């Protein structure tokens, strides 16, 4: 029931660079994941212009940020178009071989890690703060799947038996021990205000008891 895949060499190389390079401005991961959510939400809205039934899986269009200090996880949930199994396998709906190669070439020329989104591979910035990332997703044309990687050159894909999502993507960041500031309400609010003020969807930061 669990399939294990090797990353393409270039993507493994970029993930190692992200994990091993000294770079203090780690907060940019949240801007990148919220940006991906906003793009996925725009995609389902665009499809709904010609087929209103595309929203039968959920009419709410939103992004939720759910910190969990007990599990040391930060979960980003959106109700966007979601990814099929093929999209997960194809580097989470990106042309990441091309993007990761171009980004690493720009870094060699003096660009910085914060420019990752310009290369269409911003998702991998999750590894600045997370030791493991789980991506649960549901697209109207496929079943609910879980993608997961702790880097190390491979990722797994499995059918998800967890809480059904209806439609969209949930990114669960299992944070590194020294990166728990990203579970603090004031810190998350600061990052969203700084980097995501023009995202056209409600971003709700959940409170913990
Ligand atoms: C059917 C095609 N599906 C989607 O595009 C989709 N569905 O769900 C997502 C998604 C991916 C990730 Cl990594 C998130 O963090 C959030 C999200 O909603 C996606 C995204 C996949 C990839 C991307 C990144 N862009 C891909 C195209 O080039 C610019 C960067 C954004 C969203």
Q: Whose CA is nearest to atom 27 of ligand 1?
A: 94
93 lines ligand 1 (CB under 6 A): yes
Paired sense of beta strands 73-78 and 2-6, if any:
unpaired
Q: Which residue from 104, 88, 69, 103 is spatially nearest to 206, judged by alpha carbons?
A: 69
Buried b (16+ CB within 10 A) or exposed e, 70-83: eebbbbbbbbbbbb
Q: Whose CA is nearest to atom 2 of ligand 1?
A: 83
Instruction: Write down the domain spans for the chain.
Output: 1-209
DSSP bridge pairs for 44: none
* Residues 15 and 124: beta-carbon distance below 8 Å: yes
Q: Whose CA is nearest to atom 15 of ligand 1?
A: 33
Ligand 1 atom index nearest CA of 37: 18
Two tokens at 57?
Answer: 């899986």
Two tokens at 123?
Answer: 């998702």
96 lines ligand 1 (CB under 6 A): no
CATH of domain 1-209: 3.30.565.10
DSSP bridge pairs for 67: 74
**Phi, psi for residue 148 in degrees, rounded to 5:** -150, 145
Rounded to the nearest angstrom, the distance between the alpha carbon of 39 and the centre of ligand 1 is 7
183 lines ligand 1 (CB under 6 A): no
Angle at 129 between CA 88 and CA 150, to 5 degrees: 45
* Residues 162 and 148: beta-carbon distance below 8 Å: no
Burial of 68 per CB tally in 10 Å (0-12, 13-18, 19+): middle
Q: Whose CA is nearest to atom 13 of ligand 1?
A: 123
For residue 181, give Cα distances in angstroms to 22, 188, 195: 18, 8, 17
For residue 174, give Cα distances in angstroms to 3, 45, 73, 200: 21, 30, 5, 27
Q: Which of 30, 75, 78, 92 has most ligand 1 atoms within 8 Å of CB, for mutation?
A: 92
**Phi, psi for residue 170 in degrees, rounded to 5:** -125, 120
Resolution (A): 1.4
- Rounded-to-integer distance, Cα 140 and Cα 118, Å: 28
Q: Which of 29, 65, 83 has most ligand 1 atoms within 8 Å of CB, for mutation?
A: 83
Q: Computed over its alpha carbons, how large is the radius of gyration of the chain?
A: 16
Query: Who's near 29: CB < 8 A, 6+ residues apart?
Result: 125, 126, 128, 129, 130, 173
- Rounded-to-integer distance, Cα 167 and Cα 162, Å: 14
Paired sense of beta strands 168-175 and 203-205, if any:
unpaired
Two tokens at 58?
Answer: 């959920």
């Amino acid at each position: 029931e669990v399939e294990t895949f090797a990353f393409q060499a270039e993507i493994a190389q970029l993930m190692t660079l992200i994990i091993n390079t000294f770079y203090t401005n780690k907060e940019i991961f949240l801007r990148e994941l919220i940006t991906n959510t906003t793009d996925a939400l725009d995609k389902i809205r665009y499809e709904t212009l010609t087929d209103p039934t595309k929203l039968d899986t959920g009419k709410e269009l939103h992004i939720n940020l759910i910190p969990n200090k007990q599990d040391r996880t930060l979960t980003i949930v959106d109700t966007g178009i979601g990814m099929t199994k093929a999209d997960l396998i194809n580097n989470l709906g990106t042309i990441a071989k091309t993007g990761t190669k171009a980004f690493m070439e720009a870094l060699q020329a003096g660009a910085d890690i914060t420019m990752i989104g310009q290369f269409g591979v911003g998702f991998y910035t999750a590894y600045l703060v997370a030791e493991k990332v789980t991506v649960i997703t549901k697209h109207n044309d496929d079943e609910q799947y879980a993608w997961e990687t702790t880097a190390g050159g491979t990722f797994t894909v499995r059918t998800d038996t967890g809480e059904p999502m209806g439609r969209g993507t949930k990114v669960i960041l299992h944070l590194k021990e020294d990166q728990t500031e990203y579970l603090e309400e004031r810190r998350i609010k600061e990052i969203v205000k700084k980097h995501t003020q023009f995202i056209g969807y409600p971003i709700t930061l959940f409170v913990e008891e």
